[PDB]
């Protein structure tokens, strides 16, 4: 558990519908939502591979479970019942535990993704921004849509705004 979903980010965004992880930006040109497409696509790929791994690894084969025995073959019938019951118990136990463990893994994976996105943005901004705490960053310098597109992309120019941000800090 990394601490981001239901942690220092207390709630999800219903209006952000173009992805799983994203940014809400507020400038003097207007506010908006914008999803991180790369992280969302990576998450989609990994969840798809997990679902495929769970499903198409069963490797079934043609079988006929039912058998018929007469009244003088009760021991063989009970042996067949024992085989069927043992297989049933094994499969139900494995299925339940498998589902629970992978639900843990998936939820933790999403939490990790959110935390890593936050850390990436924080390491980009450094002291040019102040951490409010809910998951937000107040810029010390007035930067427009190009600046925030750069922050989202990963090409934020710290030296360009360092002098401007030093005065207001």
């Amino acid at each position, epitope marked *: 558990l990394f601490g981001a979903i239901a942690g220092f980010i207390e709630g999800g965004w219903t209006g952000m*519908v173009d992805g799983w992880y994203g940014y809400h930006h507020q400038n003097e040109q207007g506010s908006g939502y914008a999803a991180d497409l790369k992280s969302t*696509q990576n998450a*989609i*790929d990994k969840i*798809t591979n997990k679902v*495929n791994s769970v499903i198409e690894k069963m490797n079934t084969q043609f079988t006929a479970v039912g058998k018929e025995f007469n009244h003088l073959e009760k021991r063989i019938e009970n042996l067949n019942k024992k085989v069927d019951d043992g297989f049933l118990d094994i499969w139900t136990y494995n299925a339940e535990l498998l589902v629970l463990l992978e639900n843990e893994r998936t939820l933790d994976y999403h939490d990790s993704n959110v935390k890593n996105l936050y850390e990436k943005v924080r390491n980009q901004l450094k002291n040019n921004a102040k951490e409010i705490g809910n998951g937000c960053f107040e810029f010390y310098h007035k930067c427009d849509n190009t600046c925030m597109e750069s922050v989202k992309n990963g090409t934020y120019d710290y030296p360009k705004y360092s002098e401007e941000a030093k005065l207001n800090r």
Partner: antibody, heavy 122, light 107 residues
């Protein structure tokens, strides 16, 4: 998650037509809508696409200036309107969108409608 | 967008279909997509984003970018893999271009 198209039929050359795609299982406020046609003999041809928010609409060269795409989120419906129909437009038309685990992927088209038949003959 | 008009396979063999621009190179930013269509059914997405195979698509379909062209590989083709195969290339987030079909025949 299904898409169903309706509104096709026969149109005289030079007329107009409106095709409606209706979605069930998901909200149209969270998905984009792409319109793609297939000639009876030939391959797929992308006509147009309307974005998730409905602010950016992008058309092909064969549909720019003739075809209009609109999306009503309250009714969960999308409309493609043609007002320059020529005899080359006789085709099966499809509304499509991309959804993976409940979220929109604009660069994928995995949900398809059955399509409707549009005939343009005198 | 250019595809080979028709190719043939043997049951249990490996085939590679190619998609490329007529006036440029193909990269990841074009998000090549591969569709399988039978004549009486709507198309089916097989590979999107050069690598991503949606849930339910059998594992014998793979995608990649070779040289300057997208490639779809079917390993161990079955009798049900005989259909039309279309390629889609993107310029912007919504601008798409479909290529002519590649008619695959399973002998």
């Amino acid at each position: 998650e299904k898409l169903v198209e309706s509104g096709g039929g026969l149109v005289q050359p030079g007329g107009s037509l409106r095709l409606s795609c209706v979605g069930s299982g998901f909200t149209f406020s969270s998905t984009y809508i792409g319109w793609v046609r297939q000639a009876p003999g030939g391959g797929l041809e992308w006509l147009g696409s309307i974005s998730v928010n409905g602010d950016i609409t992008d058309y092909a060269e064969s549909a720019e200036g003739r075809f209009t795409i609109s999306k009503d989120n309250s009714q969960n419906m999308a409309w493609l309107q043609m007002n320059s129909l020529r005899t080359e437009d006789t085709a099966r038309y499809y509304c499509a969108t991309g959804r993976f685990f409940g979220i929109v992927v604009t660069y994928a088209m995995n949900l398809w409608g059955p399509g409707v038949e549009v005939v343009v003959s005198s | 967008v250019i595809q080979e008009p028709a190719m043939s396979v043997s049951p249990g063999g490996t085939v590679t279909l190619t998609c490329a621009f007529r006036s440029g190179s193909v990269t990841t930013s074009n998000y090549p997509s591969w569709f399988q269509q039978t004549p009486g059914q709507p198309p089916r997405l097989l590979i999107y984003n050069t690598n991503s195979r949606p849930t339910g698509v059998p594992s014998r379909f793979s995608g990649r970018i070779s040289g300057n062209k997208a490639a779809l590989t079917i390993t161990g083709a079955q009798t049900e893999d005989e259909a039309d195969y279309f390629c889609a290339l993107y310029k912007t987030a919504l601008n798409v271009r479909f290529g002519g079909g590649t008619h695959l025949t399973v002998l």
